[PDB]
């Protein structure tokens, strides 16, 4: 849920915080944590390639299992559900009856103590991982692979799920959270159920410093810049034509997906915008 702060200070007037109801333990597994240092948006050359990034609280990486293929037919039980700075959703900790501890994205409705099983013979309860050919059409899944063996890449953020529309031949037609229809090989794996923290989007951060803790730096508008610095000022926009924005590097609006792409053969349809 969401806990709303009382307006005792202008920094917390309309603010709110995540009511960490689903969290069970406040510390990570020691063996599944890896070091992680910030970069500030600078590439190997040292130049800023992504702007507005830097600062922010120190964080440590939790090793997440996006490649659940090693353990088939080995049941596991969820030990705790806990916090992860690196992603929007919570992470669940699995104790395998085999004796190995792993981390996964916590799906919706998953409580402590449940049994998670993966393979071809697993049930269709939330949290179970199946190859796509064994998943009946019409169910909601998450953490879907793109190529058969490359690890989950799709529908990972909080409160996000995809609808397995159907199967045909070698390809299953899915709908992305964005809303488009995409085909993927039925030999890919996916986890049943949605993703937790559906109430993430309702957080009101409230003050500038709170967003600065999250490693985001302030953005300067283009109009208040000098013509040597930003191509705005010329062309206007507003309500005259369509050159409303120009990127700092001079590029106007338009489709940016590269035409003549291999994966274009797999796209049943693109997403739609504009009511």
Partner RNA sequence: AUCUACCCAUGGCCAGGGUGAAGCGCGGGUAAGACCGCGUGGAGGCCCGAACCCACUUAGGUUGAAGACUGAGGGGAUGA
Partner RNA sequence: ACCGGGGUAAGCCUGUAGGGAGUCAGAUAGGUAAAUCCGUCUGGCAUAUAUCCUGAGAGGUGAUGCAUAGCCGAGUGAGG
Partner RNA sequence: CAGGUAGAGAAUACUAAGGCGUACGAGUGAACUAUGGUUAAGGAACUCGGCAAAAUGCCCCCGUAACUUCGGGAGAAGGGGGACCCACAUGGCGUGUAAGCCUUUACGGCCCAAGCGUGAGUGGGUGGCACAAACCAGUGAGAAGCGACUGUUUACUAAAAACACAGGUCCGUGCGAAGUCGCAAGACGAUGUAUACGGACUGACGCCUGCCCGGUGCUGGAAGGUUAAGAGGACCCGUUAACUCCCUUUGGGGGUGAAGCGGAGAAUUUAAGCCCCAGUAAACGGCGGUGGUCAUCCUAAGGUAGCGAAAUUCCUUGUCGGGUAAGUUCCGACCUGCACGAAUGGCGUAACGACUUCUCAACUGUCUCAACCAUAGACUCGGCGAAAUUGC
Beta strands (DSSP E) in 27-156 are: 33-34, 61-62, 76-82, 91-96, 101-105, 115-116, 129-131, 140-142, 144-145, 152-154
* Residue 212: alpha-carbon gap to chain centroid: 20
Q: Which stretch binds Mg ion (CB under 5 A): 76-84, 120-128, 152-160, 262-270?
A: 76-84
Out of 14, 40, 149, 248, point to the residue binding Mg ion (CB under 5 A): 14
159: left (phi over 0), alpha (psi -120 to 50) or beta: left
Which does residue 145 bind out of Mg ion, RNA, none, counting CB within 5 to 8 angstroms by kind?
none
| Window 198-227: residues binding Mg ion (CB under 5 A) | 206
| Window 106-135: residues binding RNA (CB under 7 A) | none
Residue 78 CB, shortest distance to RNA, in Å, is 11
Residue 84 CB, shortest distance to RNA, in Å, is 8
Closest-by-Cβ residue to Mg ion is 234
| Window 58-77: residues binding RNA (CB under 7 A) | 58, 61, 63-64, 77
Q: Give 178-191 as a DSSP string.
A: TS-EEEEETT-EEE
| Window 154-213: residues binding RNA (CB under 7 A) | 154-160, 163, 165, 175-178, 180-182, 197-201, 203-213
Instruction: Please report which helix (H) or strand (E) contains residue 55, including its range.
Output: none
Out of 51, 73, 137, 168, point to the residue binding RNA (CB under 7 A): 51
Spatial CA neighbour of 221 closest among 233, 210, 212, 213? 233
Which does residue 1 bind out of Mg ion, RNA, none, counting CB within 5 to 8 angstroms by kind?
none
**What's the token pair of residue 228?**
């040597």
170: left (phi over 0), alpha (psi -120 to 50) or beta: alpha
Per-residue x/- marks for Mg ion, 28-67, CB under 5 A? ------------------------x---------------
Whats the size of the chain, residue-wise? 275
* In contact, 89 and 161? CB cutoff 8 Å: no
What is the rounded CA–CA span in Å between residue 227 and residue 219? 17
What is the rounded CA–CA span in Å between residue 269 and residue 182? 7
Confirm or reject binding of residue 13 to RNA (CB under 7 A): yes
Confirm or reject binding of residue 21 to RNA (CB under 7 A): no
Q: Which stretch binds Mg ion (CB under 5 A): 17-25, 60-68, 147-155, 237-245?
A: 237-245
Residue 197 CB, shortest distance to RNA, in Å, is 6
Residue 158 CB, shortest distance to RNA, in Å, is 4
| Window 240-269: residues binding RNA (CB under 7 A) | 244-249, 251, 253-258, 261, 263, 266-267, 269
To which residue do tokens 């402590």 refer?
Answer: 112
Out of 11, 73, 109, 149, point to the residue binding RNA (CB under 7 A): 11
What is the rounded CA–CA span in Å between residue 118 and residue 124? 10
Which does residue 247 bind out of RNA, Mg ion, none, counting CB within 5 to 8 angstroms by kind?
RNA
């Amino acid at each position: 849920g969401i806990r709303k702060y009382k307006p005792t200070t202008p920094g917390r007037r309309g603010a709110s915080v995540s009511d960490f109801a689903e969290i069970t333990r406040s510390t990570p597994e020691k063996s599944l944590v890896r070091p992680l240092h910030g970069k500030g948006g600078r590439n190997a050359h040292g130049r800023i390639t992504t702007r507005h990034k830097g600062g922010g609280h120190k964080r440590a990486y939790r090793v997440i299992d996006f490649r659940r293929h090693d353990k088939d037919g080995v049941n596991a039980k969820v030990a705790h559900i806990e916090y992860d700075p690196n992603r929007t959703a919570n992470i669940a900790l699995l104790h395998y009856l085999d004796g190995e501890k792993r981390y996964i994205i916590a799906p919706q409705g998953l409580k402590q103590g449940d049994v998670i099983e993966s393979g071809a013979n697993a049930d269709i309860k939330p949290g179970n991982n199946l190859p796509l050919r064994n998943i009946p059409a019409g169910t909601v899944i998450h953490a879907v692979e793109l190529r058969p063996g490359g690890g989950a890449k799709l529908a990972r953020s909080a409160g996000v799920s995809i609808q397995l529309l159907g199967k045909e031949g070698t390809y299953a037609a899915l709908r992305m959270p964005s809303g488009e229809i995409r085909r993927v090989d039925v030999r890919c794996r996916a986890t049943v159920g949605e993703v937790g923290n559906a109430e993430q989007s309702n957080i009101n951060w409230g003050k500038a410093g709170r967003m600065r803790w999250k490693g985001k730096r302030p953005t300067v508008r283009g109009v208040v810049m000098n013509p040597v610095d930003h191509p705005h000022g010329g062309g206007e926009g507003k309500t005259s034509g369509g050159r409303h924005p120009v990127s700092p590097w001079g590029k106007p609006e338009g489709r940016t997906r590269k035409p003549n792409k291999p994966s274009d053969k797999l796209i049943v349809r693109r997403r739609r915008t504009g009511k």
